[model samples]
Target: NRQKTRPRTKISVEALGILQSFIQDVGLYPDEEAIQTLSAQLDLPKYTIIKFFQNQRYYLKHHGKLK
Candidate 1:
């Protein structure tokens, strides 16, 4: 299937904090199952969670920011 650009939306600070904490609690790198679980719990797309994890790590590495 062809991939299309997904629209981005702002998450509330509370949700952002929860997501960040969840990642930290799980680990910097989690398995696909963990990601899938998170997606279901958050009611977000699996791909979006994957990309968010990737982007967060990339931003921290390159920009030196938590983001």
Candidate 2:
């Protein structure tokens, strides 16, 4: 069996806002690297960001499986 993988979907403004709020509400602030600084900014924790990308990628993969 063969399956084709799709490119990563474009992140939406809503999602970005949710991500932003997530950081703020937790009383955490982004460092100089900001969102792209996942590895550099220890305050947000690299594992947390990794988990998010993993989950989102998984959902996108399975969600389009029927297509």
Highest-lDDT candidate? 1
Model 1 residue runs over 4 Å out of place are 1-14, 65-67
Candidate 2 Cα outliers beyond 4 Å, as residue runs: 1-36, 39-43, 65-67
Residue 67 C-alpha lDDT in model 1: 37
Q: Which lDDT values do the candidates have, in the order given?
A: 0.72, 0.53
Cα RMSD for predicted model 2: 13.1
* Backbone Cα, N, C clashes tallied per candidate: 0, 0
Predicted candidate 1 versus true structure: per-residue lDDT over 1-67, tens digit per residue: 8788865575545557778897778756767898788767776777767777878777667885453
Candidate 1 residue pairs in clash (backbone atoms < 3 Å): none
Model 2 pairs in collision: none
Compute each candidate's TM-score over C-alphas.
0.64, 0.37
